[PDB]
Amino acid sequence: MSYNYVVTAQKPTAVNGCVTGHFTSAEDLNLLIAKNTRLEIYVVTAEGLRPVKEVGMYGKIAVMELFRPKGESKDLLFILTAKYNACILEYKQSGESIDIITRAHGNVQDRIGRPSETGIIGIIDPECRMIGLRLYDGLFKVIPLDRDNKELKAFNIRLEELHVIDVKFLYGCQAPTICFVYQDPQGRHVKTYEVSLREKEFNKGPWKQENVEAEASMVIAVPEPFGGAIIIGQESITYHNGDKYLAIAPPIIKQSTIVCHNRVDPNGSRYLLGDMEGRLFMLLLEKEEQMDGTVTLKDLRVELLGETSIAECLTYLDNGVVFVGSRLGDSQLVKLNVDSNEQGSYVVAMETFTNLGPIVDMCVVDLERQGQGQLVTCSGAFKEGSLRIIRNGIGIHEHASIDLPGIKGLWPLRSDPNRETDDTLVLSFVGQTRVLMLNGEEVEETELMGFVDDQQTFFCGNVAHQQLIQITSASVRLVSQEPKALVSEWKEPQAKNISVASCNSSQVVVAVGRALYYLQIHPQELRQISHTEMEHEVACLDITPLGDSNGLSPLCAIGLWTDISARILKLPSFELLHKEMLGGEIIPRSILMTTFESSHYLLCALGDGALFYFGLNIETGLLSDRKKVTLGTQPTVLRTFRSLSTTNVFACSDRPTVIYSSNHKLVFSNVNLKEVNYMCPLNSDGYPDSLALANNSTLTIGTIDEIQKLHIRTVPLYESPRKICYQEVSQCFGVLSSRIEVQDTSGGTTALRPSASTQALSSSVSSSKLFSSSTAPHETSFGEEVEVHNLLIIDQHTFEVLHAHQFLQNEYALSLVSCKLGKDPNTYFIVGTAMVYPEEAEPKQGRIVVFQYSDGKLQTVAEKEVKGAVYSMVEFNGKLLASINSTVRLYEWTTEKELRTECNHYNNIMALYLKTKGDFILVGDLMRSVLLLAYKPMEGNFEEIARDFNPNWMSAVEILDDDNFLGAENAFNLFVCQKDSAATTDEERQHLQEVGLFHLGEFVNVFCHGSLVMQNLPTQGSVLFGTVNGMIGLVTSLSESWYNLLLDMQNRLNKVIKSVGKIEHSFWRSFHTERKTEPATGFIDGDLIESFLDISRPKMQEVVANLQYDDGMKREATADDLIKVVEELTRIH
């Protein structure tokens, strides 16, 4: 059968609900952002945000809210998943042990019932006595909050009112009560009730509110001083407290729907409000101290505060700092002023957060012809539309080009004492020596000192006493303010050549054979203190600036010839701290001593491509177990440096990596360089504090940005991108986009903001009005936000918008391919468009227009009016395949710049998708399924090979390997269909079989081929996908032996890692439509298997049971080889 493997490339970024409170400790405000399945726990600091613990849960977090029950100083957290699995959590901290403990759980679902229309609503009572839920459209589930629930009990008190819009608990009124916004069959109103837990029944409610605004959307309960409710509607704001009432319809809240809210002040004095256009408001309340104890409301003010991203979270933290969370792109943290700016806004922009948004199209593309590909994702929405470019590794691309191959080292020379100004360098060959200057990206050679212009150098540092160390043949000396005579040439009393020396700012370490020297740097004095000898000759030497910014290092690096040396010394006095000798002909480029912000590690760069994990305490001398990491076939170098700050660590190897961080974790990430041997701390005039890199190739003065796996670059367009294609011959993208415009009375239309559609280098307009006979575009009354689409053609390297092309009025564009058709040697753009009209069913108009971009000018070559909307296009064997309102229409490019229909297919509900490989055609229907359609070229027509019958609502399809077909579903699921083999009749071969089911709890928009890692010429193939929460993952094909290897590991791993919430992983990944709950099969959930790397060995040994291992042969499972399997998978991603 088909066996596949699913991991997560990019963790989901778009946010869903944000709650503040005191979840970590008693007296510390924090923020609890849930995004799709992750639960991030930040903390509110004076500088911004600071993460504490990120927890991934098994389910979509739909409703979360903090609550402090009476009897706990800290608070608790309720989370309800999308599969109705409720949990109650508690943070618990003990030293480095930071754990989340589920206090109660239990699935709460009814057997029968329509789910919802307004989604899932959950409200906590203010007195912390019950937990309400709106789940199944005619019920109100009540969870009685007490210590009695070791598992959560549940009531179902019947709502007599069916279609409830919003619901809250009102504040302190001596009895827990409920507000509604109920849509009557004739009108709509706001009713109340009162829950009796002891009697499971509604008592009498105190408010009536027989008719409220016809588009009332939310309830905002106001607190304990002057309790009540505010009913925000589309056009007006009300207030009710049983007797009194106010109402405003201010002219600010007219053009956008209020969607989010929060309570700014603790006595309800202020309220922020966001909308669907970007605006933040502030609903001020005028507190009227009417009597000696009476607090009543007096006035309702609405103040515009400015434009942010389109919010779905809204949380006020402290000190005028508001967090804005955006599903639709670029969640940002903002600051509210007191006075105003030049535009009247109080919103100060602070640090943002990158969101891949709703990805709607992708393309895997390479722009440096390397083995590593880039991924351009059409991210965002209405004004947050932006292309985002995703790369692995570390992008050192601003680098100077210097022709110095195979150089051993470049060491500084200065005369300015307090500055880095005028730093000259040292050229040190083996047998030759020169002096280098730096003109930024260019170099010059001269003669400056006169000491080392005759013999080579190896190590020349920067002494903190404003001096320098010169190591020439067998002696060291200090350096004055650029002299020509020695300060103090301390000779060696052996008359032997130095094998390997080293230097620092306060100490000199020279190895001559086995004798190891020490110099105490006094001002213009080199005093001898200590000395030691090794049992073999010394291979190399390394000095690291460990502490106090003086150069003092209490530890040493010992490497010996033809023997792995783990000998550890006290480098000033040379006291033996630990003595370990491994053995072997492999030589280490000795030791990198760098603390990765939590523990000091020893990093041994072994020869001919090997790497060990050594961990050392700096005061005792205890080492942990070792671990082999493959690097290459050559001896490697492990260094650290200062790029701009934060003490970055680099691995100079044949597989060059940055060791220092990967989302604050010791995980390697590559660079965009083929091979790195050495590094050089230069002082470039065009690159501040950067370093040059010596290789078997050129020298690259480069710096390193924020270190992460998936480096993301944002090209904003300020309009929603539709699709993305790519020209290989021409160097230009192609982006269909969407601009919102309102209609003018005198003029035609007008836009709302200067997006990157109008602001281009050239524009054009659609002509040849071939839809002129239709009287369907009737005149509209107001400018009620029509859409105008165009074709953005974006530059390759600068990403400037080269050209746009406006289409006809009310003409959407739904498909984009750029291929070659026929023997015409041009390479075109083909845009499949359609004519839309509101107050209308499916459209039957539209056209397909072939564009070309000869020499910076977009040209309309051909056009073909087709009755029906053109949903998806693919190239098919030199022919353009289309998909036009449940009809699959194959074309053929004639010589006379037109098209002739070759064939058609009609057994389709709505043919929305097309995917091809060779001569087979994959069609994704609206309601039915995967559909496989042949093409017999000798017959001139199509042919139905097979068809799946099970009604799955498609989202995205992709052919895997010409036997297995992957599809996506609206029910957030994945499945593989298979063309059948035992074709004993014609009925058993027209029925596709569903082989494999899986709940990837996320909506898949895109599929594409292409890996993101280097082609080093395992698994087979690589399919990435693009979703609505910014979750990129990889789907690839396994081998049938490793399927049973890994699937046996999952069922062992499903008893070790206790997931947060006590949710069975078999229960979450189960295929769950509205009617089927078949358990998940066929796929391998790699994100659980990748978590085996984090488990400790006293628990990994219980993972390794009496199991199997295939190295045809047979062997019991062991620890060190199963962890080798995961790292072979982790290098895919």
Partner 1 sequence: QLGSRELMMFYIDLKQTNDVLLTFEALKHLASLLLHNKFATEFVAHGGVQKLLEIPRPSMAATGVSMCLYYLSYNQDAMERVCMHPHNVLSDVVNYTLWLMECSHASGCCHATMFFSICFSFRAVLELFDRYDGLRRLVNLISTLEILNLEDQGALLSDDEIFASRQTGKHTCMALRKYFEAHLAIKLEQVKQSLQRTEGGILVHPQPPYKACSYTHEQIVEMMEFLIEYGP
Q: Is 926 helix (H, G, I), strand (E, B) or coil?
A: coil
C-alpha 607/C-alpha 568 separation (Å) is 19
C-alpha 21/C-alpha 27 separation (Å) is 10
Least Å from the CB of residue 938 to partner 1: 8
Six token digits for residue 767? 């002509």
Contact segment (CB under 8 A) with partner 1 among 284-292, 399-407, 671-679, 767-775 equals 767-775
Count of residues touching partner 1 (by CB under 8 A) = 10
The 10 Å Cβ neighbour count of residue 257 is: 15
Least Å from the CB of residue 900 to partner 1: 8
Least Å from the CB of residue 165 to partner 1: 40
- The torsion angles phi and psi of 38, rounded to 5 degrees, stand at -85, 150
Least Å from the CB of residue 902 to partner 1: 8
Least Å from the CB of residue 940 to partner 1: 4
Six token digits for residue 306? 């400015």
Least Å from the CB of residue 337 to partner 1: 53
Q: Which is nearer to partner 1, 1 or 776 (CB)?
A: 776
Q: Which is nearer to partner 1, 446 or 775 (CB)?
A: 775
Least Å from the CB of residue 878 to partner 1: 16
- How far from the centroid of its chain's Cα atoms is residue 961's Cα? 28
Q: Which is nearer to partner 1, 370 or 901 (CB)?
A: 901
Q: Which is nearer to partner 1, 696 or 904 (CB)?
A: 904
Q: Is 588 helix (H, G, I), strand (E, B) or coil?
A: strand
Q: Is the dihedral of CA 905, 909, 912, 914 positive or negative?
A: negative
**Is the CB of residue 420 less than 8 Å from the CB of residue 684?**
no
Q: Does 767 bind partner 1 (CB under 8 A)?
A: yes
Contact segment (CB under 8 A) with partner 1 among 235-243, 744-752, 773-781, 984-992 equals 773-781
Contact segment (CB under 8 A) with partner 1 among 363-371, 762-770, 915-923, 1053-1061 equals 762-770
Least Å from the CB of residue 922 to partner 1: 24
Q: Which is nearer to partner 1, 255 or 904 (CB)?
A: 904
CA atoms within 13 A on the CB side of 1057: 26
Q: Does 897 bind partner 1 (CB under 8 A)?
A: no
Q: Which is nearer to partner 1, 497 or 768 (CB)?
A: 768
Q: Is the dihedral of CA 47, 52, 58, 61 positive or negative?
A: negative
Residue 932 forms beta bridges with which residues? 922, 946
Q: Which is nearer to partner 1, 454 or 896 (CB)?
A: 896
Secondary structure E strands in 1019-1097: 1020-1027, 1032-1037, 1083-1085
Q: Which is nearer to partner 1, 114 or 900 (CB)?
A: 900
Region 1022-1061 residues binding partner 1, contact defined as CB under 8 A? none
DSSP-derived pairing of the beta strands 669-670 and 657-658: antiparallel
Contact segment (CB under 8 A) with partner 1 among 568-576, 764-772, 800-808, 985-993 equals 764-772
Q: Does 769 bind partner 1 (CB under 8 A)?
A: yes
- How far from the centroid of its chain's Cα atoms is residue 53's Cα? 17
| Edge-to-edge order in the sheet of strand 139-144 | 121-124, 130-134, 139-144, 155-158
C-alpha 234/C-alpha 242 separation (Å) is 23
Contact segment (CB under 8 A) with partner 1 among 154-162, 485-493, 561-569, 770-778 equals 770-778
**Is the CB of residue 871 less than 8 Å from the CB of residue 881?**
no
List Cβ neighbours of 403 (8 Å cut-off, separation of 6 or more): 698, 699
Q: Does 775 bind partner 1 (CB under 8 A)?
A: yes
Q: Which is nearer to partner 1, 633 or 768 (CB)?
A: 768
Site string for partner 1, 607-626 (x = CB under 8 A): --------------------
Q: Does 895 bind partner 1 (CB under 8 A)?
A: no
Least Å from the CB of residue 821 to partner 1: 18
The DSSP string of 746-761 is SSSEEESS--TTTSSS
Six token digits for residue 652? 């100079």
667 CB burial (10 A radius; 0-12, 13-18, 19+):
middle
**Is the CB of residue 934 less than 8 Å from the CB of residue 923?**
no
Site string for partner 1, 847-886 (x = CB under 8 A): ----------------------------------------
Q: Does 773 bind partner 1 (CB under 8 A)?
A: yes
289 CB burial (10 A radius; 0-12, 13-18, 19+):
exposed
Q: Which is nearer to partner 1, 767 or 781 (CB)?
A: 767
Contact segment (CB under 8 A) with partner 1 among 370-378, 570-578, 768-776, 992-1000 equals 768-776
Q: Which is nearer to partner 1, 645 or 773 (CB)?
A: 773
Q: Which is nearer to partner 1, 878 or 1018 (CB)?
A: 878
Q: Which is nearer to partner 1, 745 or 767 (CB)?
A: 767
Q: Which is nearer to partner 1, 866 or 931 (CB)?
A: 866
Six token digits for residue 523? 């001002």
Tell me, letter by letter, the H, E, C secondary structure of 546-571: CECCCCECCCCCCEECCECECCEECC
DSSP-derived pairing of the beta strands 930-936 and 941-947: antiparallel
- How far from the centroid of its chain's Cα atoms is residue 86's Cα? 27
CA atoms within 13 A on the CB side of 66: 20
Q: Which is nearer to partner 1, 899 or 956 (CB)?
A: 899
Residue 593 forms beta bridges with which residues? 602
DSSP-derived pairing of the beta strands 4-10 and 1083-1085: parallel
Least Å from the CB of residue 898 to partner 1: 10
Six token digits for residue 374? 């880039």
Least Å from the CB of residue 889 to partner 1: 14
Contact segment (CB under 8 A) with partner 1 among 96-104, 465-473, 763-771, 1062-1070 equals 763-771
Least Å from the CB of residue 890 to partner 1: 12
Q: Does 645 bind partner 1 (CB under 8 A)?
A: no
Least Å from the CB of residue 767 to partner 1: 8
Least Å from the CB of residue 877 to partner 1: 16
Region 932-991 residues binding partner 1, contact defined as CB under 8 A? 938, 940
In 3D space, the residue among 948, 946, 909, 945 whose CA is nearest the CA of residue 929 turns out to be 948
Least Å from the CB of residue 837 to partner 1: 14
Least Å from the CB of residue 769 to partner 1: 5
Contact segment (CB under 8 A) with partner 1 among 255-263, 751-759, 769-777, 992-1000 equals 769-777
H/E stretch holding 390? strand 386-391
Q: Which is nearer to partner 1, 727 or 887 (CB)?
A: 887
DSSP-derived pairing of the beta strands 559-560 and 568-569: unpaired
**Is the CB of residue 649 less than 8 Å from the CB of residue 662?**
no
Q: Which is nearer to partner 1, 938 or 1113 (CB)?
A: 938
H/E stretch holding 1103? helix 1097-1103
Go through the chain and list every residue after which a break occurs, taking a C to next N gap over 2.5 angstroms, comma-separated: 1017, 1111
Q: Which is nearer to partner 1, 48 or 940 (CB)?
A: 940
Least Å from the CB of residue 872 to partner 1: 25
In total, the chain counts a number of residues equal to 1133
Least Å from the CB of residue 766 to partner 1: 12
Rama region for 290: left / alpha / beta (φ>0; ψ in -120 to 50; rest): alpha
Residue ranges binding partner 1 (CB under 8 A) = 767-769, 772-775, 900, 938, 940
